[PDB]
Ligand binder design. Structure first.
Ligand SMILES: CN1CCN(C)[C@H](CCN2CC[C@H](c3ccc(F)cc3)C2)C1
Ligand SMILES: CN1CCN(C)[C@H](CCN2CC[C@H](c3ccc(F)cc3)C2)C1
Lengths: 402, 409
């Protein structure tokens, strides 16, 4: 290679514990040799967040909002046990939450599938992109305890001083109970519509909506309605191009049609098996520019203690890798970077293809040969698996020089 | 059969399509030859519910409410194409819905475990009974639309008149959306508690309650606060009698714990959609039994659909390979329960013998294309690796004859 690819503007977010070591190995051995980036790196490790009073995570938020691409390493969501581990000054909020609240958009999870790994239904040769709602949860759902008898009613009082409307969720004639309250603004449904519609074009796959409008009068209905409204006003001519179609089926048919399906569609369902190390979540924002990619697991603290105590460790990096490769593939779309485009997809193909050739870590090996029959020779540690990914990537990029 | 065993009073429900065919094969080859029942048989087939204007289903529900055991066959719930198929005069409501709404109770789904069948990933040596809420969650779950900006909020005013809590659920600044309100009575969660202890009490496995506290803390807090007191004030001494117990772990803890445990526990989930490792692959291997809190009346049914695809093969003269194990275990679960109500030791042994010879026969290598595809791989399985539906019934009937004859000697 004459010159390294000109990446462009990407925001990088370092994490902590096991995945922090994976992260550097990934940059050092896979990304940096081949791509130069205008890198906006932030240190979202727990020590620094503690030291900067969580200010650094807010800066990351604002920087993805500007440069439209982010790739994030798994971070510790602390608790009471970890404020003794690091003597935190305060129980900080989740970094992942604080970016989803600031940046907005819709998370999309996808499991990466190798032809020689077990699966739930063995017909799913194409992966399934399941992305439900925003924020990690529809913000709150105020719920109380109704200790004794009395009416519980939910009221809507219009801001323009018009007639108030009460509904009566239940009158408790005798005995206790429990009560609940949800809601869903309208904008968050259009943001959900656009985000999910865009991923259908970005991936060239069909998009399905699933609801329970049969039981819920007009809560789940309002979803169906706004999608049809948006789907016929925009994106309908764009779907006709790339063969993609959209349709809304009932959730109970869709659950069985998933097993009936062969894979390769997007499923947005108004609400975890899978090696826990092959799943990559992507937050796609409503504008269709800014997008944060990251892995869907955690800091792998048990495998970090094996690293701390010097032990051998066999941790799986594919989930983190494909955070880089989705982020880079997105920037290559924005900048119309035809050469970063190919690099990203190539990187995705060695990971999957290096596993298909029998080179994998312990977790993947336990999926095939069962955990009680996994042998040292059936898997690689954490390093020499990256070493094998590295040289396979050098081998493949040299090939694709024509 | 010289004086075959006298099984009690039981309600039978006939279904639709290829499961209706299996139901007759089950009675003809497996049930009737060895048992005599005061049989309250109802025809829930689609064209009968259309002719009775769904009155046959209400009638069959009353019968289970009166006679305490019902054994159902998979039935068609109609849609737009089904009302055009049979030319129905109304898109009738699901019989399962209609009956569950009458009997009430809670539904438990048990996975039938065979040794030579790849069930998830080895490990599990015994099934797992997964139970969910009682009356769905609708009825009075009030939802609606928010026309414009304003404050949506929930107010609890006791019959005491002594206070009033107001919870803002959301203030609409933009204008527009949907809001709702749900609830649950203690009597409804107390029913979950009995039904779930009664089930654990029926078998000999321990009961677990997996709640979610990070999402709806206070809503789910009441569940572990209605179970543990009923367990302690009514069930702990009986559970402490046998090797049973009642604990309470958590969702992300339970799913990590169950992927190492040898199976054998009643699991109460409080979520809204189901098919974890339970509805895995071949639905032909899962039962489903509604339990009324009384512990008397129950209603078994195979957890899969009417298998339309194979009934079309039947109509065109093709040989089929549909798995009857689920419908076969609709009977034994329900016959074993009838035996418990009457101490019918003869019937409990039979029902139990049928659960053995059905698994024995699959473990022996004699199975249907349904299962064989799991072992070999669907393109791999040659004709010679499975059995016809009739072949499979014939070998059950054959091995059940030998299983009942031997222990009778
Ligand atoms: C993500 N959680 C955070 C909390 N705990 C420390 C968990 C313990 C690690 N488990 C054991 C192997 C699995 C695994 C395998 C490969 C991977 F790349 C990641 C995880 C998960 C992991
Ligand atoms: C089970 N429902 C029935 C209602 N639908 C029409 C669905 C189609 C049935 N598919 C055909 C082969 C599978 C199958 C094979 C053996 C079985 F015993 C059950 C299912 C599932 C699913």
């Amino acid at each position: 290679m004459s010159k390294k690819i000109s990446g462009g503007s990407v925001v990088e977010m370092q994490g902590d514990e096991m995945t922090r070591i994976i992260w550097e190995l990934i940059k050092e051995k896979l990304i940096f040799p081949y791509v130069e980036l205008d890198l906006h790196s932030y240190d979202l490790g727990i020590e620094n967040r503690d030291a900067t009073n969580d200010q650094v995570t807010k800066d990351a938020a604002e920087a993805i909002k500007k440069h439209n691409v982010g790739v994030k390493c798994a971070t510790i969501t602390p608790d009471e046990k970890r404020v003794e581990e690091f003597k935190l000054k305060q129980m900080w909020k989740s970094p992942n939450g604080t970016i989803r609240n600031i940046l907005g958009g819709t998370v999309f999870r996808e499991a990466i599938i190798c032809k020689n790994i077990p699966r739930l239904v063995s017909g799913w040769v194409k992966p399934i992109i399941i992305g439900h709602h925003a924020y990690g949860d529809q913000y709150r759902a105020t719920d109380f305890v109704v200790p004794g008898p009395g009416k519980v009613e939910i009221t809507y009082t219009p801001s323009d001083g018009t007639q108030k409307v009460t509904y009566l969720v239940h009158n408790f004639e005798e005995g206790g109970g429990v009560a609940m309250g949800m809601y869903n603004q309208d904008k968050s449904i259009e943001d959900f519509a656009h985000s999910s519609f865009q991923m259908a074009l970005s991936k060239g796959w069909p998009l399905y909506l699933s609801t329970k409008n049969t039981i819920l009068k007009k809560y789940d209905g309002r979803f169906k309605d706004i999608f049809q409204e948006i789907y016929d006003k925009q994106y309908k001519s764009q779907f006709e191009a790339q063969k993609i179609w959209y349709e809304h089926r009932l959730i109970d048919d869709m659950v069985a049609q998933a097993m009936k399906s062969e894979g390769g569609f997007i499923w947005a369902c108004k609400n975890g098996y899978g090696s826990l190390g092959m799943m990559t979540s992507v937050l796609v924002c409503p504008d269709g520019k800014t997008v944060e990619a990251e892995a869907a697991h955690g800091t792998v603290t048990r495998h970090y203690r094996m690293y701390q105590k010097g032990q051998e460790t066999s941790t799986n990096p594919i989930a983190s890798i494909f955070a880089w490769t989705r982020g880079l593939a997105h920037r290559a779309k924005l900048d119309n970077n035809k050469e970063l485009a190919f690099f990203a997809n190539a990187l995705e193909e060695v990971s999957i293809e290096t596993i298909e050739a029998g080179f994998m870590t312990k977790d993947l090996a336990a999926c095939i040969k069962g955990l009680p029959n996994v042998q040292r020779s059936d898997y690689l540690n954490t390093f020499e698996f990256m070493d094998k990914l590295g040289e396979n990537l050098k081998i493949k990029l040299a090939q694709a020089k024509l």
